[PDB]
Ligand binder design. Structure first.
Ligand code: D1M
Ligand code: D1M
Lengths: 810, 810
């Protein structure tokens, strides 16, 4: 039907239909009289999976003949979402499958909705690892993602009486057609034990053993016939485990618990033993697999020429002392040579400067769990601090700031300091975030080794985040400029010549309106919720966290409502304010923010005086597949973190690519986006990083703002006196207290500029044609934010390998 | 190659090869350069499985159109062994697969050895359920076996320093190609809670819920295109389970533990809570599935016309009060009508008279776990005892003997009494065992309801237990009489006309010698063990239990050794004495017996004076696939339980069918076997049941035998003084003590007749031609012991349905 969806050849369509019927019979053991839509989903998934396999085997065979340098991306998170449509997109099968299933009397979109998300991540750091895998495959790199196959991913969020409830995300319940278990490549991982010193060096003994069993999932490049591997480890007890006979068998659960469940905190460190086991487990299994693959290519000098390991934040930072352990204890390399190899192999990406998000593990934990790694870490530390001492003689304070060991209450290991010492490259994830690292938290390290520090601004894949979720837009774009932009997103610049083209203006706006109607209807079907699709769709979707300032958005919504109640018969641009995202289970403030949002909707949505001029909707269970629906439907993207706190953001990029305009602070990647599109085509407001620093030197006093802004004082008194909670007038006193006395994120300080910037958005929205022309200028300069650009810079500037756009043979 | 293995058609062979290559590529995602023999096994299994599926769908469709009465066989055990060769046998695919794999350069026998046994049973009661499923399918009955999918089956037994060690049987580790998960038919099962009485009757509330998820395994009939279903339940937590968030997710293991592991006690009751949960779980899930299937055929009068439920011992006896619960509480039938339906639906098979093997559950357990079922059981009891009182007025002792509630220390429920009250038919499993039930433990019930009591002598399937494991013998038989005997085992009688036929005599003995060489070599390959294949293969294989009297066998072995040491230069018929079987983990006496056996082998096998005239081998890890190898190789079958204690035995039947002669007591089915072949063609010795009773009245005094039999006293002094345990002279004092002071099974009493009967066996073995003619007379009268005969009598005499040998269309 639409051209970017590929060819529906007579031969291909006939083949698909017969393979579909074959899997329904032989794989699912069903016939058409008894098959449910779920059976039909599976028959289609197995049919599409069959097309991957030849390419998968051929790709891994090619890497074996050519022996290129291999890239290993280690992450505790891979937030993959659904796989069926993505695989059709990259194989150019979408129109053929659509034709084939329509001929069998099925609606392929209905079947797509049955697939569970693979929710193996929390938010932007896990989704970044997913876009990156897609980009590495599209650029033909010999790349493997390594992680943990969690049996339960991020929880499903239900809202009850306006509060978040969590329920287990049992995503494997019906099976997962995309993974292949590889029980034959199972590997042991050791925990506890003790260290013995021999004349022959150290030996780690009396350990408990857990087995790591791999499951491989294919990752197709965009039409290049490349299929790389995502290898995820599952924990298994050994068979003589303990071996009541009955209790000994039931206790095998203790081992297997390692891979049971994703820790749901995001941008917040919890120093729990089970989380540390998961970190060491992924690292110990992955490095044996790497060294094995390297040996089947004695001489470890060539290791860094044949291997790169990229650490996704500090979560796999144990790779560094584990590599040393293997090289020194097992392979008997001397320390200095082992260290040289390690540093040249590893690189570290940082994704935060929030102090609560930094991993600092108690020494007593590492001592019991990983006694040999703590000894290695002490030694790394001693030699590193001898280099600091030589470079800055007498600077005893620098010695204590830079140490890997933090002195104090409980001694801890600063995992970020360890990564910087044992990596040849450290990067931040947006230009302002990388500059902040050099000037504040890693300033001492930068002074020591300036050449290690780099920037790699984040990106998103344009396959998932345009072609897949917004085919209407990808299509009016390809009509004018062809299809090559899908893997060369810079070509979108050519659209700047269409900014005054009347046909284009109208098509861009027609596509948005269609996305809006489709999403308005999804809301009613799947949630009985009623919206005006003519309203401006004002959307803030991301994890709930105080730094993201969903609370500033709430204050704006209450101001708009109060203004209406004051002058009811005045005209206002109608809005649908949608806010969604999950809160970590013990992050009390974040759960209270969810409750506030729904409590506002309760008042605002049933006030007859408002009518349909204002609606506040909490979008439940926000996750990758929900992103794919709401993002194409949005007009306005809320990116309103306090300057200096959103390291990059990526949701911001998705919205820009999909024809929403952005209201935001000069934070993270928002700075580079404004610079690409021009500041006149973005709605920037609020303190810059400099302004935040100046307010901190003086002292932030929220009372000052409350005293000087009568619209703000009114909202606070409404919150305090029970206006939004009539049956429990003091429900929101923790929120008021925090805003009044300990707001780390200065919500009041940005309030006036934010409300005034929102009036400018409403003014532009009144003029459809100039709103759309500014939209065009955003889409057209979104090219820099493709993850293919990001990954080509990692390849060239960190990994030392060349991307490639050439097809492997079909 | 051999004719009972079917046709190797050019078309069929070409098809198999291409389907094999297809599964290797698309299913296993491998190519020939990297595939291991395990990959090859799986590609062949998937290829054979594909031939089942059309027949499976067609069979279940046929039962839906025809609506026959359905038979439900409820067992906690299905001891299935391997499936690949069995499926080839019943589909007539064996020679074609053999040809196909040979053409691909593979040895199909080597691939067969890779498959794990499905070890979902302990011994004869679980294996009986497996032979029965095969027979129900071959006779075309609409039959479903229902059980539990244990994640760990019976443990793997290793021997270390002569002691049994147990290790977990992780049989699912590589996946199971034969099962299909059916997550869409998942059902809730309730535990704990409390009972509320309403005006509308009773209600069971505040329960914890566990989900039962079914996995279906196909069960092919012998060349009739029938494929029935074995449906096994797996335990799953619900998703809001509890729902630390992390602890709540990890605690889902508590629910799932129900289906984790098979209880490894056999013929011994352990009253553990987890075992009771497993019993109720299988029963509650199965009956909802039955009632569902019955409704999709309001009027429960026709329920017994459309449903039979067969209870395999008392393990699923909760079916009776669960059926009442459903009918009374949920369907609102009145009690009397519900009771009529129940009794007409259920039938109970007993498999023991050992008091330690009878289930008697503590009331306090049922009270907490299943409060409504205990109330139902009290009510059943009260009404049943009102009928006893009316029939035997004033007989207060009869009232207390017959009650379902046993008074005492802890009140218990006698589950056997409940089964008899709520079933229309009770059967024992061999004629002497059924007579014993009527005369001793169920005598009171028989007097009340004589018409309930029946016999159904056990049998074994001739597909697994002749065609599959002994193709050489099935082939020389089919040459003379054709192939029809495979599903009409009575036809073996025709072989009696070949008893003096010289060609036949020689072929029967050639087949045995070949089985013996093949097994001698298996011992060296897989176990470095060295045997004389010219020796008489004297084999005792079965679970270790005092009633089976592996100890009597040991005494005979020590007597033979002592006789050799006394007259070393005398001629003796050389023997290989093989004993194997598993001991339950806390059955201390049984583990000591294993240690004794290996300790005897240690002495006997390295005494140079013995040479290779005597060898004692402990066969490790005895299980269905090991049975299939040793049984065709045996000359002499040891069936030596104390008269009145082996309810039937089935291993005895396997050996008879495979050309071993039997030495045995007049116990269980041995009585009917001797009667079929003629007593002159069996080696019967020892007390009859009558002799055992007479000795019990007088009092058994083992000292008397020790005092009067100098060969027996010598063995005892050897045991006591440390002859078989030099480094720990008192290792065996518990065994001596038991034999001397508390032998429930009278091992000494049968000792003299046993040793003398063994001299007669050795005398016959000296004359190959008359040994073989007596072999022929055994094989030829083994027909009655086919499970098709057993199942045709259940069908006609209990279930009220007619067997059928007709093919469904291909
Ligand atoms: C440490 C750390 C973390 C960083 N990020 C996100 O990582 C994303 C990809 O770099 C950034 O765009 C975003 O600014 C940042 O908050 C997370 O989503 N979770 C974290 O725990
Ligand atoms: C109760 C009970 C049991 C009975 N049988 C066996 O059940 C077999 C099949 O009926 C009999 O042949 C054999 O004599 C008997 O011991 C078992 O193997 N285990 C038991 O727990």
């Amino acid at each position: 039907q639409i051209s970017v969806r590929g060819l529906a050849g007579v031969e291909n369509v006939t083949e698909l239909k017969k393979n579909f019927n074959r899997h329904l019979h032989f794989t699912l053991v069903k016939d058409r009289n008894v098959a449910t839509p779920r059976d039909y989903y599976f028959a289609l998934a197995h049919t599409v999976r069959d097309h991957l396999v030849g390419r998968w085997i051929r790709t891994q065979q090619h890497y074996y003949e050519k022996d290129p340098k291999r890239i290993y991306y280690l992450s505790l998170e891979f937030y993959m979402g659904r796989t069926l449509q993505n695989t059709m997109v990259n194989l150019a099968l979408e129109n053929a499958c659509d034709e084939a299933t329509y001929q069998l009397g099925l609606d392929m979109e209905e079947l797509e909705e049955i697939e569970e998300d693979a929710g193996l991540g929390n938010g932007g750091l896990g989704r970044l690892a997913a876009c990156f895998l897609d980009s590495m495959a599209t650029l033909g790199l010999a790349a493997y993602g390594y992680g943990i196959r969690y049996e339960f991913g991020i929880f499903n969020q239900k809202i009850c009486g306006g509060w978040q409830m969590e329920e287990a995300d049992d995503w494997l319940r019906y099976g997962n057609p995309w993974e292949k278990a590889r029980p034959e490549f199972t590997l042991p991982v050791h925990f506890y034990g003790r260290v013995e010193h021999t004349s022959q060096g150290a030996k780690w003994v009396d350990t408990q053993v857990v087995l790591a069993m791999p499951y491989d999932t294919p990752v197709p490049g965009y039409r290049n016939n490349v299929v790389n591997t995502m290898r995820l480890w599952s924990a298994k007890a050994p068979n003589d485990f303990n071996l009541g006979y009955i209790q000994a068998v039931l206790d095998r659960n203790l081992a297997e618990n390692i891979s049971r469940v994703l820790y749901p905190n995001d941008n917040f460190f919890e120093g729990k033993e089970l989380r540390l086991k998961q970190e060491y487990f992924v690292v110990a299994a992955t490095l044996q697999d790497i060294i094995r693959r390297f040996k089947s290519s004695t001489n470890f000098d060539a290791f860094p020429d044949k291997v790169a390991i990229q650490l996704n934040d500090t979560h796999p930072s144990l790779a560094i002392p584990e590599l040393m352990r293997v090289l020194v204890d097992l392979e008997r390399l001397d320390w200095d040579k082992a260290w040289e190899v390690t540093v040249k192999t590893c690189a570290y990406t940082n994704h935060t400067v929030l102090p609560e998000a930094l991993e600092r593990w108690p020494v007593h934990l590492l001592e019991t769990l990983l006694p040999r790694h703590l000894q290695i870490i002490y030694e790394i530390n001693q030699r590193f601090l001898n280099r600091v001492a030589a470079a800055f003689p007498g600077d005893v304070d620098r010695l204590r700031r830079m140490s890997l060991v933090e002195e104090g209450a409980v001694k801890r290991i600063n995992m970020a300091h360890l990564c910087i010492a044992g990596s040849h490259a450290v990067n931040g994830v947006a230009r302002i975030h990388s500059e902040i690292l050099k000037k504040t938290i890693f300033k001492d390290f930068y002074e020591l080794e300036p050449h290690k520090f780099q920037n790699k601004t984040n990106g998103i894949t344009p396959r998932r985040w345009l072609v897949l979720c917004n085919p209407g837009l990808a299509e009016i774009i390809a009509e004018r400029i062809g299809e090559e932009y899908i893997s060369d997103l810079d070509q979108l610049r050519k659209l700047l010549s269409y900014v005054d083209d009347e046909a284009f203006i109208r098509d861009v706006a027609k596509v948005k309106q269609e996305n809006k109607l489709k999403f308005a209807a999804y809301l009613e079907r799947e949630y009985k919720v009623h919206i005006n699709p003519n309203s401006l769709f004002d959307v803030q979707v991301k994890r709930i966290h105080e730094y993201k300032r969903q609370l500033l958005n709430c204050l704006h919504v209450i101001t708009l409502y109060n203004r209406i109640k004051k002058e009811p018969n005045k005209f206002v641009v109608p809005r649908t304010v949608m806010i969604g995202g999950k809160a970590a289970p013990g992050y009390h403030m974040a759960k209270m923010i969810i409750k506030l949002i729904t409590a506002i909707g309760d008042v605002v949505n049933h006030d007859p005086v408002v009518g349909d001029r204002l609606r506040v909707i909490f979008l439940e269970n926000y996750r990758v597949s929900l992103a794919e629906k709401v993002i194409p439907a949005a007009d306005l993207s809320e990116q309103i973190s306090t300057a200096g706190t959103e390291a990059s953001g990526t949701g911001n990029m998705k919205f820009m690519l999909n024809g929403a305009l952005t209201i935001g602070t000069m934070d993270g990647a928002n700075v580079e986006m404004a610079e690409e599109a021009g500041e006149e085509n973005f709605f920037i407001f609020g303190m810059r990083v400099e302004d935040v620093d100046r307010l901190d030197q003086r002292g932030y006093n929220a009372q000052e703002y409350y005293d000087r802004i009568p619209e703000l004082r009114q909202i606070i008194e409404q919150l305090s006196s029970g206006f939004f909670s009539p049956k429990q007038p003091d429900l929101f006193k923790d929120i008021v207290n925090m805003l009044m006395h300990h707001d780390r994120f200065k919500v009041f300080a940005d309030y006036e500029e934010y409300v005034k910037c929102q009036e400018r958005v409403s003014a532009l929205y009144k003029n459809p044609r100039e709103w759309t022309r500014m939209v065009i200028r955003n889409i057209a300069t979104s090219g820099k934010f493709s993850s293919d650009r990001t990954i080509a810079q990692y390849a060239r500037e960190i990994w030392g390998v060349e991307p490639s756009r050439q097809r492997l043979p079909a």
